[PDB]
Scaffold this active site. Sequence first.
Site, PDB file in Angstrom:
ATOM      1  N   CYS A  47       0.568 -11.427   8.310  1.00 36.58           N
ATOM      2  CA  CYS A  47      -0.308 -10.710   9.361  1.00 36.58           C
ATOM      3  C   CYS A  47       0.133 -11.485  10.772  1.00 36.58           C
ATOM      4  CB  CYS A  47      -1.647 -10.475   9.266  1.00 36.58           C
ATOM      5  SG  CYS A  47      -2.141 -11.935   8.562  1.00 36.58           S
ATOM      6  N   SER A  48       0.371 -12.517  10.714  1.00 37.93           N
ATOM      7  CA  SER A  48       0.581 -13.437  12.025  1.00 37.93           C
ATOM      8  C   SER A  48       1.872 -13.658  12.383  1.00 37.93           C
ATOM      9  CB  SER A  48       0.184 -14.869  11.621  1.00 37.93           C
ATOM     10  OG  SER A  48       0.840 -15.239  10.391  1.00 37.93           O
TER      11      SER A  48
ATOM     12  N   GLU B  76      -2.069  -6.792  -6.850  1.00 36.08           N
ATOM     13  CA  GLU B  76      -1.492  -6.597  -8.024  1.00 36.08           C
ATOM     14  C   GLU B  76      -0.132  -7.641  -8.236  1.00 36.08           C
ATOM     15  OE1 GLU B  76      -1.671  -1.558  -7.868  1.00 36.08           O
ATOM     16  OE2 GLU B  76      -0.287  -2.596  -9.315  1.00 36.08           O
TER      17      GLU B  76
ATOM     18  N   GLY C  34      -3.660   0.129  -8.933  1.00 35.98           N
ATOM     19  CA  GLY C  34      -3.807   1.156  -8.065  1.00 35.98           C
ATOM     20  C   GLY C  34      -5.177   0.897  -7.380  1.00 35.98           C
TER      21      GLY C  34
ATOM     22  N   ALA D 232      -8.373  -8.502  -2.069  1.00 35.43           N
ATOM     23  CA  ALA D 232      -7.537  -9.786  -1.614  1.00 35.43           C
ATOM     24  C   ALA D 232      -6.121  -9.364  -1.472  1.00 35.43           C
ATOM     25  CB  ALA D 232      -7.805 -10.964  -2.449  1.00 35.43           C
TER      26      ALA D 232
ATOM     27  N   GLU E  42      -9.491  -7.106   7.713  1.00 38.99           N
ATOM     28  CA  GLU E  42      -8.607  -7.896   8.584  1.00 38.99           C
ATOM     29  C   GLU E  42      -7.160  -7.151   8.246  1.00 38.99           C
ATOM     30  OE1 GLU E  42      -4.999  -9.316   8.782  1.00 38.99           O
ATOM     31  OE2 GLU E  42      -5.668 -11.193   8.196  1.00 38.99           O
TER      32      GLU E  42
ATOM     33  N   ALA F  46      -2.357 -20.596  11.182  1.00 41.43           N
ATOM     34  CA  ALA F  46      -3.925 -21.063  11.703  1.00 41.43           C
ATOM     35  C   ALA F  46      -4.432 -21.972  10.803  1.00 41.43           C
ATOM     36  CB  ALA F  46      -4.611 -19.840  11.941  1.00 41.43           C
TER      37      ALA F  46
ATOM     38  N   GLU G 259       3.976  -2.144  11.595  1.00 39.05           N
ATOM     39  CA  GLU G 259       3.838  -3.509  10.740  1.00 39.05           C
ATOM     40  C   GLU G 259       5.004  -3.402   9.845  1.00 39.05           C
ATOM     41  OE1 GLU G 259       0.654  -6.905   9.757  1.00 39.05           O
ATOM     42  OE2 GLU G 259       0.601  -5.069   8.420  1.00 39.05           O
TER      43      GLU G 259
ATOM     44  N   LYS H 287     -11.081  -8.248  -6.632  1.00 38.90           N
ATOM     45  CA  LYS H 287     -10.015  -7.761  -6.805  1.00 38.90           C
ATOM     46  C   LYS H 287      -8.640  -8.403  -6.303  1.00 38.90           C
ATOM     47  CE  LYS H 287      -6.887  -3.752  -6.773  1.00 38.90           C
ATOM     48  NZ  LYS H 287      -6.075  -4.512  -6.183  1.00 38.90           N
TER      49      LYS H 287
END
Lengths: 516, 516
Positions: free
Chosen positions: A322-323, A210, A240, A181, A288, A478, A417, A207
């Site tokens: 990300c958007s 961090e 890590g 995640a 993604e 979204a 990015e 997971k």
Amino acid sequence: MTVEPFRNEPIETFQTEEARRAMREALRRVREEFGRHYPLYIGGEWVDTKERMVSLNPSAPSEVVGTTAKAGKAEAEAALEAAWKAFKTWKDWPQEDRSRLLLKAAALMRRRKRELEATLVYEVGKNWVEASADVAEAIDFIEYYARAALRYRYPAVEVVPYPGEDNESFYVPLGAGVVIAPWNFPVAIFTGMIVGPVAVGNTVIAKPAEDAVVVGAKVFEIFHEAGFPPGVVNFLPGVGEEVGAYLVEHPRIRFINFTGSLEVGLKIYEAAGRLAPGQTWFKRAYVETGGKDAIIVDETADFDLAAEGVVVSAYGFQGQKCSAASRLILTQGAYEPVLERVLKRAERLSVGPAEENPDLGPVVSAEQERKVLSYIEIGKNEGQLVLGGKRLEGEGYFIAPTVFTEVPPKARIAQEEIFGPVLSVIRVKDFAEALEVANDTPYGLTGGVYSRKREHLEWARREFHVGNLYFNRKITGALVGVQPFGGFKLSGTNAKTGALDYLRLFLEMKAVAERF
Amino acid sequence: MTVEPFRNEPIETFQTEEARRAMREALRRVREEFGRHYPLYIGGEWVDTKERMVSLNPSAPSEVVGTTAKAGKAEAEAALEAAWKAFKTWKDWPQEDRSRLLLKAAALMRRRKRELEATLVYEVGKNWVEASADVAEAIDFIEYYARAALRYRYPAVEVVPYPGEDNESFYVPLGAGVVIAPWNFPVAIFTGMIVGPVAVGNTVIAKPAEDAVVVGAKVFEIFHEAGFPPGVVNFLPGVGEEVGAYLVEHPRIRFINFTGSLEVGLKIYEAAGRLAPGQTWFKRAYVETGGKDAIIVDETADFDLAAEGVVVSAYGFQGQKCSAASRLILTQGAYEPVLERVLKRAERLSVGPAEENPDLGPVVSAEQERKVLSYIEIGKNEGQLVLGGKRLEGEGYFIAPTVFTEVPPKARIAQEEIFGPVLSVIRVKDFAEALEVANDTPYGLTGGVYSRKREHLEWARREFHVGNLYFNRKITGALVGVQPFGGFKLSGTNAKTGALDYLRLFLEMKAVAERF
Ligand code: NA
Ligand code: NA
């Protein structure tokens, strides 16, 4: 089971005194609990470790917001054993029973909304509305997937009959898998990636990122109170690549659900394609992996409307989405009027400690700060800095809203990015060139067009090659159910979250014939 | 567009004089046409090469059924360029227009049924009914996918509405991909794997199996006559790995559809997980990779019914099916009665040239013959040979129906896919042990149970972990539409052929919002 039709959880605006009071109360409760330690969650119980991880306030990084246990390979293996043990019975629960469990979780999360929001504020530097949207989206994933899962219930498949036989096709879950995640939506996407697979009978090892281990633990408090059977969901904060690599490469991991950087996504996908020694299946990996998202504005647009949507899209949560709009593509007639408005709006944005509800909080970490400032240095060689481009005073990781202009479409800052508050402005001749420039990146996640010209909008509908396209509005945020979320190209595998199709990814089909 | 509801194409039994007359004439014409040469098909035209490939008659391998052109890397590149050029416009055809093209192709194939069956008889050594079933299934795939494709038509996605906005989600095809087809169903699976992706707007480069190049060419004559636009479907017979490796690893190949051996499937899936230099997407790879399929019989079964179904499932097309019964698991009470019936039935099976319509023709090639005979030698040292176990006299690749009994469940012949007329019989205590043994292989494609006990049948429905399970009937011959076909575990990625869900694999979703 019959529940009200799905509606999105309202996003709190804090425009009432009561809402503001409630938030101040939650902020106080959360900070009084900064000393808390949160163990792992394995097989229905909290399990501590010798080593710990520290979570920091990015608005005041000398301030610790919590500590967690730290998982290694041994704890990953224990979680995997627990998840497979749980799968053996969890897969056989009636769908109605699994969906009710999700609905219970959503009810519990809704009751703790302000607490979770305030935790997002302190732990990952979201302002108040960004924090509320995040939690509301999490609730939405639970509500939506609980209902969507019923659409797949035994026996769901439409088949052609045959004389003298019953032919019955139905879906079954895959098994135990791993969820990796992101830090940027550590309630929303953390929850969605877990509960989607779990709703239809899979089990999960999660997971958290961090930077967001505390809020992940609080989501697990909700799962525990909801009463997911031991082993169904497991929580393994780690430092890590150890835990993630171990599981991704494991012969007994059935699927991998990942949201994060392209670098890591490419590695995960490659690994998933390999048969580990003793593995007895083809792994599924859903990734993604970010975007380089553009808004196009043409000369027919409402320039004020466009400028507002661009600033929201570029700078919301400090551009760490990300958007996020990281490219602004302006046709010749739109260039000056839109750029002038964008600059006037952006220059008025506040930046400061997230709890004060500024327009921008800090970026999430020292490492994020380092990355964003490095791209700013790159940008100064590629385009023209016209706004921002510097660290602001304070130990918190505050970066000014940044605009580069005259950026060549193939510049690093126009291709890579950055995941910070950095907008690159590109001037193009006409709408055709705008689309060409919009499409010419390795990514394909979100995009937008501001225009009144119907023919341009519909042309973009057909040819602006992004998974989530928006006209005359922001390109971020979204909504579950409303806008299936997921991209094309190097933005990932097009696993559309908050859509009926998501759950199908976590199922396989069996066909059983009986000749009478 | 409105057509009759889907029905399966009847499989000709050749019991009427009319059917025999027509088949005899078809066989004579195919035989008279031995030696014909078939070029590649690239960009809407037949393209010849200097080098050539030979297709032999496995019933009489001195006889050349035909020759074809031989593609190398250059032809593969040309086809890929043609497929991408075609995609740009083919993706934009109304679905109704694409579906009508398929229906035309099905009508042309139906009119050429006898010719195609006769070509199967000579080129791959199918008896008459095996050949008819193969062509019928091909017609079914075209008819089924033509209709199924309409269920995905613009804008097909169910979304939640939002005030002041239109939210429209819809599917789009992926691009140009490669099909790698098997020799054992070289009309049916060849056709299905191509027309499914093409129906919904993809374009395809197809590599037929070496042993079945002539019949692949005849299928392409049908595609050409139907009027698929240039570049939409392309035909690249080749020798060895060259063409397949080049395309699978290509940065500009979008997807890979493969049916064949596990060893090749593993390689394809691993390669598909890699980002080739310059590649701008995550490749999709769909693989169907064989099975080690069992029929369980318990002491409550109709033993005569069971024996007949076992013999059909084990020896149809010489056991050269991914669905073939290669294991017979008999509970203690069923062991002697069922084995004696199976042996009595199997020893009566005729073996000879496929044109004579024997129960068994030859295996497909000299290498296949060598492999099956090697497994028989291995088998002799693992279980007890009780029937056959030898090559028969003649130049054709004729192998006797073979049975081993008292086979250990973990024996190589009880674990590894032999793909020939070799049945391994395993004796177990009871039904629970039967299921354990059934499940304890790396595969999960087809399986069967003969039993009158309801509780055993329903238990197997829940716990016999194969993608296609059949009760009290043969385990081969899954019908398009009726029995979605595809497996679990190392039988592949569960891409269910002849099912609505198959086409979704070849689409991605876009979500477009307009705020008014
Ligand atoms: Na933090
Ligand atoms: Na041949």
